[PDB]
Structure 1
Amino acid sequence: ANRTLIVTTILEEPYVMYRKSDKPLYGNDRFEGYCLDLLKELSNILGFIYDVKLVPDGKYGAQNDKGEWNGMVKELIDHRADLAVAPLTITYVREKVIDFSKPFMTLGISILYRKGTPIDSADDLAKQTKIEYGAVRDGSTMTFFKKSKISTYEKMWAFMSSRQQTALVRNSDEGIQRVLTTDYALLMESTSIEYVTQRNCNLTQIGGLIDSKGYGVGTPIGSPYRDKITIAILQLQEEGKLHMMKEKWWRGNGCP
């Protein structure tokens, strides 16, 4: 039999979540979400079974000054996992070190905050001095700011970095809690803003999308699975299955 593939992933609603049950759940059955449904589909098309393993350091992945990676990206570089199936952003810096499938979803960075402020854009947010802001540490949103040559975003990076231990949160849940309880706005991918703002009516998007990019399945460079995964993603795309999965996990509209 084909060796069981190791899948690295991360908890992120509604992609990967703990299933609620009154009885014990083991192995893959502990998890549900868009990315678990994606895995069920891809594995049917490619002919494998898999073992879902949450990334030990709880990070998506960024590189330090020494060029060392962490998170799911590191798991792939180091051949600890065969695939990363998660809301994993396809980026230039990552594509140089891992192989991504074609995208299965598109999105862009935007701002999550509470309601009732005059802040209407990143420019407004960077300029004002009442509300703090940040991003999840060691994800692509942090990296977008770190790498930006756009003045507003350079200032925003310098601010986030100056108070990093502070402004950069461990994960999206900590970020959302910080938005709800303190004067802090979270730079967040739009598909997650769409999800949370239809569930918590105290939350809102500020401004539009600041960029546009995709999520892809990650594999180590040279993986004999990447092309097969790409072909399967295109099948699911064209058959309307990715759209159906999005509707399933985001439905419906809960806030004015």
Structure 2
Amino acid sequence: VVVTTILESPYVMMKKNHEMLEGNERYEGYCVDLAAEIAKHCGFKYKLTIVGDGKYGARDADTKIWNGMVGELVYGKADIAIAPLTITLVREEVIDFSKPFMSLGISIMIKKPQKSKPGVFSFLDPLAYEIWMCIVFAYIGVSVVLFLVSRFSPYEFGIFNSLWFSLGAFMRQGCDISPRSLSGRIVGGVWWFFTLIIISSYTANLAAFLTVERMVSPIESAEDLSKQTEIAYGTLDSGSTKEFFRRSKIAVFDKMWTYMRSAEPSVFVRTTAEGVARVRKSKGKYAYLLESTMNEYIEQRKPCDTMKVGGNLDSKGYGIATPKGSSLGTPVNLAVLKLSEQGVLDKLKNKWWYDKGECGAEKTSALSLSNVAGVFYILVGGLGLAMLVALIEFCYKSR
């Protein structure tokens, strides 16, 4: 027969020594490995041909003509096909199919937002804001209690000095005054125990929260993405994703397809690498919807300037095709069943993917000033406030 590929990576990797090769040895990839593995169990002659149009079957409404990959099989130009070709009803109504040999799904693709340094006020992260509020109001309550206890049950401790003492005990710096009665000393003791526990809990693992950097994606998922319009998303042209959005009946997908269709220029693209370049040359203003396999492969490959957000919007599975009624449909089906039973498919998928991941195939380093600047700003604000307050008091006592 004749084996047609899409010249798409990693399913079709043109060999580095392309000049000095010909025939079925022209190019390499997972698809070719699978084709050989199935020719072993099927005994069918094949030629590693490539489709001229370089695109997958699409059904134009006006001409009602299959183009590229599907056209070759339907119009007799092709006998078989082994490729990253996605199943679907309309495409299945015209040609017999095999069983899935991969799992996938439509997935989002964007440019890796830069690692946001832990912003100002990062020294509060070690403790959740609930604990901070409880701490504040406990510092208030203890001082109030100490004031009440000392004023109305004495052997000084006003409210101002009481707050001073409580704060000093919370920061391990003692003060010039200590309670002299039992009823204030109990409060002091529990306050000391509480601050000891809290500080020992906070101090521990405090460099991490001043140093750790977490990336925040702008498009959390499809719903969040479609809610906004500042960023423009695109998809391949004449493919399964377009057909899936076209036949969609879900509100989010309906609005998303409306926005993509009614967006100028045309967000669409002729080929996958074009979308890759567009997202990598858009300052993160372009989002591309491709599968979950190519996406991961790209993520693993340098410079790794992209990432996948959200989860698969729908799983589809690939599948070896065949012309309707061809006698080869059954043997290829049984062949893929056998290979799935063997580890050929899992072995190939595990090896080809993550085979040569350049990026990523933590250390402890000093604190830069960017990490701990917030407390310096706070200190300077406090000094300014103190001088302002003293001037205010000075003018007030002048009158």
TM-score by length of 2: 0.61
Question: Aligned-pair distance for 1:146?
Answer: 1.1
- What is aligned with 2:319? 216
| One-letter identity of the residue aligned with 2:329 | R
Question: Aligned-pair distance for 1:251?
Answer: 2.1
Helix, strand or coil for the counterpart of 2:252?
A: helix
Contact in 1 for aligned 2:56/2:70 (Cα 8 Å): yes
Is residue 185 from structure 1 mapped to residue 287 from structure 2 by the alignment? yes
Which of 6, 11, 31 is residue 10 of structure 1 equivalent to? 6
- What is aligned with 2:112? 115
Question: Aligned-pair distance for 1:49?
Answer: 2.1
| One-letter identity of the residue aligned with 1:203 | T
**Cα distance between partner residues in 2 of 1:161 and 1:68:** 21
Which of 329, 354, 357 is residue 226 of structure 1 equivalent to? 329
Question: Aligned-pair distance for 1:147?
Answer: 1.1
Please give the root-mean-square deviation of Cα atoms over the aligned residues, in Å. 1.5
Question: Aligned-pair distance for 1:82?
Answer: 0.9
- 1:45-194 to 2 correspondences below 5 Å: 45-66=41-62, 67-116=64-113, 117-163=217-263, 166-182=266-282, 183-194=285-296
**Cα distance between partner residues in 2 of 1:11 and 1:79:** 20
**Cα distance between partner residues in 2 of 1:141 and 1:164:** 19
- Runs of 4 or more consecutive aligned structure 1 residues displaced over 3 Å after TM superposition: 252-256
Which structure 1 segments of 5+ residues have no match?
none
Percent identity between matched residues is 52
Q: Which is worse superposed, 235-244 or 111-120?
A: 111-120
**Cα distance between partner residues in 1 of 2:65 and 2:265:** 19
Higher percent of residues as strand? 1
Question: Aligned-pair distance for 1:23?
Answer: 4.8
Larger radius of gyration: 2
- Shift in CA distance, 7/22, structure 1 to aligned 2, threshold 3 Å: closer
Question: Aligned-pair distance for 1:22?
Answer: 7.0
Higher percent of residues as helix? 2
- What is aligned with 2:353? 250
| One-letter identity of the residue aligned with 2:27 | F
Which of 299, 309, 320 is residue 206 of structure 1 equivalent to? 309
Number of aligned pairs?
A: 252
Which of 4, 12, 19 is residue 15 of structure 2 equivalent to? 19
**Cα distance between partner residues in 2 of 1:122 and 1:96:** 30
Question: Aligned-pair distance for 1:238?
Answer: 0.4
**Cα distance between partner residues in 2 of 1:242 and 1:130:** 41
**Cα distance between partner residues in 2 of 1:37 and 1:163:** 40
- Shift in CA distance, 188/100, structure 1 to aligned 2, threshold 3 Å: same
**Cα distance between partner residues in 1 of 2:263 and 2:21:** 40
- Shift in CA distance, 101/122, structure 1 to aligned 2, threshold 3 Å: same
Question: Aligned-pair distance for 1:151?
Answer: 1.3
